[model samples]
Target: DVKVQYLCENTQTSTQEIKGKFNIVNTGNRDYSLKDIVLRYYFTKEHNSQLQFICSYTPIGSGNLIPSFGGSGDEHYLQLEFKDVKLPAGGQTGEIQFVIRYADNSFHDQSNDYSFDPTIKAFQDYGKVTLYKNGELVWGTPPG
Candidate 1:
């Protein structure tokens, strides 16, 4: 069992960048390996370069945050993975404050992003932001 809590500062969907903060809580009784977990933040990819994943902070190792892209619809997602780390039983991860920007420094709209919750003023159990373990959907619902 796992839960992903998320927060952000961008109130507007159409912004210069996306300020996404995340924290993962291991609800299970056993320790969890970071290598088996993957966090996906769903969003619409409209006009822009590849993408710039700028991580402001990470509990384990910021350098271990590996970024990638994936999806099965017009919408897409930014997936994050860790190298070698473990979450103790009933323990939780630290804040992962990451900022996403366009390579050209252009503006875009995320009003339709699957995981964009402007209502979240603080960290909360954000089911919209899915978490996958061993390539299987363990939490949150992925965009159709």
Candidate 2:
């Protein structure tokens, strides 16, 4: 019912921040509340430092984004959710651009990140990142 399109802005192996962009699309004829959407961007926690998520752009407004760092099956992920908002049927959340970094903005090695793809310079149907609607996997592949 839902799909996530993604691309990596930081195509280089070495970058200070994880330049990740995403767009969520609802292909079904049913509406879904933004709050029911949960998106996970899987990665390795390079260091023990706390991570920070920067929303450079979002159609729903950056303030609507709620981000948290958590782990599953020994894999670290950044879980992003939105505040209560109406997502109309056959609609899509316009491009959401974000910068992921440590609290201190240290360098991150994106090469080893599971979801990192140096080949992605533009948006495409990406399944490396996962999407969950109403707590059910609706798109992409999850960690082991």
Candidate 3:
């Protein structure tokens, strides 16, 4: 199960176009295809309803990996995109629940636990990304 989480602005602006690069470390004994991976995001604290118009894409780098946005009927990159997000307003604390749905495929043994990292500057575009280190929460500090 590969998942990453972060809290962003809880308003319409929170749904800004977000992109990032993941360095897939071949911890396993075999190589895997990044194209067969699935990315997803959601609001953790929110109710059963998920945010709308939330789209995510990957850019394959090196080793013949090229990530794209929408692909055929499955949508290549934009996995979990909301159309009209409102509950996620700004100033309030929230969570950007993330997950990779490639676990369903059983061909590969032990699906590598993937990670997502944003390159946004701390004081520049703080509201655009969810920062995490070593599987620990970094950004989305609870307001004091």
Reference-based lDDT, each prediction: 0.85, 0.85, 0.27
Instruction: Give the TM-score comparing model 1 with the true structure, all chains together.
Output: 0.94
Winning model by TM-score: 1
Candidate 3 ranges with C-alpha deviation above 4 Å? 1-15, 43-144
Would you estimate the TM-scores of all the predictions? 0.94, 0.93, 0.24
Can you list the residue pairs that collide in candidate 1? Answer: none
Candidate 3, 42-106: lDDT as tens digits: 12121122223322432321223222233222212233322222222122212332222232221
lDDT of 3 at 135: 40
lDDT computed for candidate 1: 0.85
Q: For model 2, what is the C-alpha lDDT against the true structure?
A: 0.85
Candidate 3 to native Cα RMSD, angstroms: 16.8
Over 1-144, each residue of candidate 1 has an lDDT whose tens digit, in order, gives: 988999877878699798879999999899988889999998887864777888877877788888877764467788899887888999998888878787898887878788888888899999899899998999999876
Better of 2 and 3 by TM-score: 2
Candidate 3 lowest-lDDT run of ten:
106-115
lDDT of 2 by residue, 9-71 (tens): 878788778887998888899998889999998887767778888898887898999988898
